[model samples]
Target: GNKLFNIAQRILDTNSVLLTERGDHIVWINNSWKFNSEEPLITKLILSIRHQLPKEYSSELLCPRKRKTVEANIRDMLVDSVETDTYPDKLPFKNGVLDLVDGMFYSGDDAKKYTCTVSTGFKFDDTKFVEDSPEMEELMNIINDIQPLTDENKKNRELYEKTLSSCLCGATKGCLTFFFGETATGKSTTKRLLKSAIGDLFVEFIANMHLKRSVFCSRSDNIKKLTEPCVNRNHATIIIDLMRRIAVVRFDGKIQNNRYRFAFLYLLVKWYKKYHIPIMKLYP
Candidate 1:
């Protein structure tokens, strides 16, 4: 196993931190790693590659070259973006950007620059996965009365639960959950109970759908599929060149004099990729 690779893998994986492609900042997304969302690579440089390894491998290292090199490589392997046009997706890919399977990456050419997109912020864990507090259950009990999950009404109940389950964590994908409700169903005594209810928000869902479809919403079917995560191989070309050349610079000539400037420009890529972290994490 490669020591540097394993170290980068451990720190990113253990801390759950990712450097956006440009390598200036950090982001946190658990499922993004699981889904292999390359969004970070194309749009930003910040990333973390956590795989099967010891936890202390990240912590128990020496306090010298380990810090500098580990930090540099991690930052170098970035996924940053600069979108000139509207991003790849229309309907937001519900990622650990707020977990669930959904998100996209770059569309090739000069218009869409390097870096990953749709990465909002960084944090330890997402609130969506957190368990509801016990105190909330007191009021939740009343809402449970409105939409009770009972096997008694096997015919009607199963349908509704599955309907809500679809929204819960994408149990339903191809099945289109279309809506055309009556004004009466829209305004009923149970409607208040429905708002207080849980699982899928039947009344509120299309409220998102209801608002501005924008011009992009009314796209043709051929282009319709383009909105999801589209992976391409072109981006890797730059990275591979950078790594190999760096090796050449190191193994070929040790000094930081001569042709290093020319080599650095070829590798820098707007200086975002070759960033210098202002706050060095020296654990002294």
Candidate 2:
């Protein structure tokens, strides 16, 4: 039964295309039996093998049963390592270089990146930042309008720029910022705008509502336990949230200020200068 099980598994793994079609195949039972069928190949193969087996062998012990079991096991195995949108524990780094295809992060060597299609199917050339690119015009205008003029404004701007530079440099520390305003203001819009302008620097972007549910619903007081479900809950959201928690613990030596609650406001930044991950938060 085990030997037959292995053969059936091998067929599923390597010869699935062949088995999907209907055909006659040779089988070993009490003797070599001519397995002929027009139904699904797997079904026919199992039935043929069962026909030759002793009556004592039940359906549960048949090759089809083994095939189903093996397929399920294989799926579980892949799920353990496959980087899905909701499960992005892997980082895209290979041999110390951030691998980007056509200017976007593809799967790094060793397949440590999420395998999915970029939304816009747009290719980026990081080396070329055209001043006249229409997509960047709004972003540029926003930066210019907010550029510091007054002394206090200049001080605040310097601090903000410094924090942003640190994040981009992979400082391994956390930075926090807040934005407060009425609804319909450009808070969310600005986020999208900045992302469009420098989306490559981001490891993941998450919204606040999704972050709240993942962090607060768990029964455990331990933040790690509380946040653990994020791994498979919402791919990008969970990753940003996890990085936020890590940053908080690393910076403050404790999970201070109910930080998990604001994970949606957090932006997990990957500094291009080094192989490190840093966390930044923007709030409203």
Candidate 3:
């Protein structure tokens, strides 16, 4: 309604479109008269609604879950790192140019200064560079004992382990273990092992997009098209709708901006108790 009114007013203002002279005068008069009239009415309506509710009423609503525990765990595991001592002696890499060639050789504070660590690009090392506590060793032994015996099983296990270890080691290439081999080779098996191992840590959802056919002689039909009549516009609209839905559902309460929502919920609970709203129905 306001859009149409604005359009009509603009037309009349330009003198390109107009009603009868008397009607134009009336319309202009009414537009000016009603321009400031809605503000007070809206304020009064909001106040009336406010008065109808209890003294505790607020715009904020509580989410179903108290996410503090999960948030704390994420902060600890994902954000914070356990500080380790670097090599006390001088690093083998001259002027501290750490790379894959030099290999991470350090103890005490020496290792902390360099941004990169050198590794031999191999998974296993016989030397116990990092001492494991008794409890840690016990945990490791248990994990080792659970290892599968068959060649296929062992290969799958190693592949998944390598993938996760590479990720934690800050490998620039993300999830390389999943794509290291041909599809018919051990790649799919490795990915399945990884999914079974750490799937619970990830949100349960299929990948949004994937390449159906390899970069071979596949037809260009599957390639994204934009010149088709109305197709590009329709695809854009669909993408926007999907994005909006994702924004609505996705939760990342650990973010600094989202912390205010928790405060709002806390205040709501306090106000609710003060007002003595009946505990008729509460959800977990």
Candidate 4:
């Protein structure tokens, strides 16, 4: 009886049975069970243990069909608990497999980070720059010309060159860097210049608004309603804006203890880190 109970426990833990696939119904106790088979030794052992178990024990070993049904129910329960919909748009990263719908980050073992890979169906132009003004154009040109420093402004040139080289060489240890200035101070242009100079190191560079939207939408609860603007707007832009709206809605009532809020920040940091780019600079 004890041995039968142990056998029953193993079957319950594994959630499979040792039945044969053929109609002969031969019990293959020494081997693994195939699909759609008849009762094997494992099943008989479980049946004996099932009779011994008290009614409250709920110890009957599940058949394959019942096991599948129970598993489906468990999955549904998990989905219901989260209360969020699936991401409606194409995922942003190739390595993105799970959508936790709130705040979550990729552990070091999650995938190959810093590969500069973008999501499927997403195209990025590394050479692209927002050349919307003369100042922007001149800055782009200056950045495009990645030359060694000259002696006339030797100190300033050396500092800039050293910083760029250090960043490229992975010599910089700190995680955050800030730029401060008034409006129209070339802060944005400077970043564009950096991209133009070292575009290979940068992946998809997005606006802060775009980042906020994408982060929110990727983990939103009502993806369809949030993503309805996709037809008129850039698909990417629509997805992002939708995401931000979701985050804002969640923020109103549960700002203090919302895991979704933390998940958004974690995703933002992960995105930047994965692409080897700095976070977008935007006015507060």
Maximum-TM-score candidate = 2
What candidate 1 gets wrong by more than 4 Å, as runs, is 1-16, 19-73, 77-154, 170-172, 179-181, 186-284
Ranking by TM-score: 2, 1, 4, 3
lDDT of 4 at 130: 23
Candidate 3 lDDT over 1-284, as tens digits, reads: 33323322322333211122122111112111111222322222222233333343322112222222222222233322222113211112222322222244443235334322222122222142234334335434433444454575665544433323321111112111113332354333323332332222222111321101001110233222321322201111111101111111000222223222222222222333333233211111
lDDT, candidate 2, 1-284, per-residue tens: 56545544543443222211122232222211223355323344444444434454444445546656544443333322222223222222221122321223333232322332122112323333333444344334544464434575765554434333332221122222333345444444434433443334343324432312111110124435433434213322221213454321110211232222112112223222222223233221
Give the count of colliding residue pairs in each prediction: 40, 2, 8, 6
Q: Stretches of candidate 4 above 4 Å error?
A: 1-140, 144-149, 152-172, 175-185, 192-284
Highest lDDT scorer: 2
**Between candidates 1 and 2, which one is better according to TM-score?**
2
TM-score of 4: 0.21
**Per-residue error (Å), model 4, residue 283:** 27
Query: How many clashes in candidate 2?
Result: 2
What would the TM-scores of all predictions be? Answer: 0.27, 0.33, 0.21, 0.21
Task: Give me the overall lDDT of model 1.
Answer: 0.30
Per-residue lDDT over 207-241 for candidate 1, one digit per residue giving the tens place of the 0 to 100 score: 33221111111024532332222322110010010
lDDT of 3: 0.25
Decide which is better by lDDT, 1 or 3.
1
| Candidate 2 worst ten-residue window by lDDT | 211-220
lDDT winner, 1 or 2: 2
